[PDB]
Amino acid sequence: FSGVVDIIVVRQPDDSLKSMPFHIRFGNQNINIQITVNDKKIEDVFMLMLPEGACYFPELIQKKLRPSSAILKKFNLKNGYNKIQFIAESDLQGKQLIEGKIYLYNYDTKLVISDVDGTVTKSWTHDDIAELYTNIQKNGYKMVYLSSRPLYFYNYTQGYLKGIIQNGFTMPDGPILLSPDQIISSLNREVVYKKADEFKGALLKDLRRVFPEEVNPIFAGFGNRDTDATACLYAGVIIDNIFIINEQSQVEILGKQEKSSYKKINEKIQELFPRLP
Numbered sequence: 001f002s003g004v005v006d007i008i009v010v011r012q013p014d015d016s017l018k019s020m021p022f023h024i025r026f027g028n029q030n031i032n033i034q035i036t037v038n039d040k041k042i043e044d045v046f047m048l049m050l051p052e053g054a055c056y057f058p059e060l061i062q063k064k065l066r067p068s069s070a071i072l073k074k075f076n077l078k079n080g081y082n083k084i085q086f087i088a089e090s091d092l093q094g095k096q097l098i099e100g101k102i103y104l105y106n107y108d109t110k111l112v113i114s115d116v117d118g119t120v121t122k123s124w125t126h127d128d129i130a131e132l133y134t135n136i137q138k139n140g141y142k143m144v145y146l147s148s149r150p151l152y153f154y155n156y157t158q159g160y161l162k163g164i165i166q167n168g169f170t171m172p173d174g175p176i177l178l179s180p181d182q183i184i185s186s187l188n189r190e191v192v193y194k195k196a197d198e199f200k201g202a203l204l205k206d207l208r209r210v211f212p213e214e215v216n217p218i219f220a221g222f223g224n225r226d227t228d229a230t231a232c233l234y235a236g237v238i239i240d241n242i243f244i245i246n247e248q249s250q251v252e253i254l255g256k257q258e259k260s261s262y263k264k265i266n267e268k269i270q271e272l273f274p275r276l277p
C-alpha cells in the first residue's frame, strides 16, 4: 500500500485541534517526510519512518500517530475537504510523493456512518442510496464511510464510490475509515488489542472521542450485519437511528422495528434526518 488513509481533524470549542491517527504508508532513519497542505508547504513539520514503512510525528521522543494542536494549526486547514501531500525524502531515493485527504470538522458537526460491503454493495449497488445520502448531506449532516477491507484495496473502494451514479444522484464525498485490524504497525500494535475483536465499535468510539463528550457527533449509522448495529450503539447512536439492510434489500429501522427501504426512508427524509440549524 502507498497512500494516505483519510485524515479527520476536529476543532474543539476553544479553537484547539484534535485528530484521529494518521495512517501514512510508503511501499530506516535516513528518510524524512515533509507535508504539503492545499499546495502549500508546511514549514518546520516533518514525519519519520519506521522499518516497516509506518510513519509518525516524532514528539519530544514519542512516536505519535496523532499530532498535537500546535502541529495541526500550522496546516492552515479549512473546513471540509483539504488536500495534503506527503513527500518522502532520502539521499538514496530522492523524492517519493503521495497524496491524501484531510478533513476539518467543527465540534458541533453531526456525522452519519455507512458500511460499504453489504450496505452500499449488494451481497452491484443498492438502487436508491445515492439520493438518500445526497439528501442527508443536504440537510447539514456529513457522510462518513467505513470499511473493513484490506489496505491493498483502499484506493479502489474510494474510487469506486466516486464512479457510482444512480439517476443523476452521486454519493456525497466523505472520508473512508478502516477497522484497526487492517491498519497494524508496531506503533499502534499494542493498543489495537486492548480493543479485542470489536474493531468497528472501537473505531467509532475512537472517532466519537475526538469530539468533546458534552456533544454527540455520531447521529446515525447504516450497516448490514449485527456488528454494524452493535458499533453504533456503543458510539452514542440511538437504536432509533440505526438501519441495517438484509440480503433481500429491506432496510430494517431497528428502533422502530419496521422494515423499510432507502427510497422509503428518502421519502420521509426530513422527519428521520431533520434539517440542522
Ligand SMILES: [Mg+2]
Pocket: 115, 116, 117, 118, 119, 223, 224, 225
Ligand atoms: Mg458490511
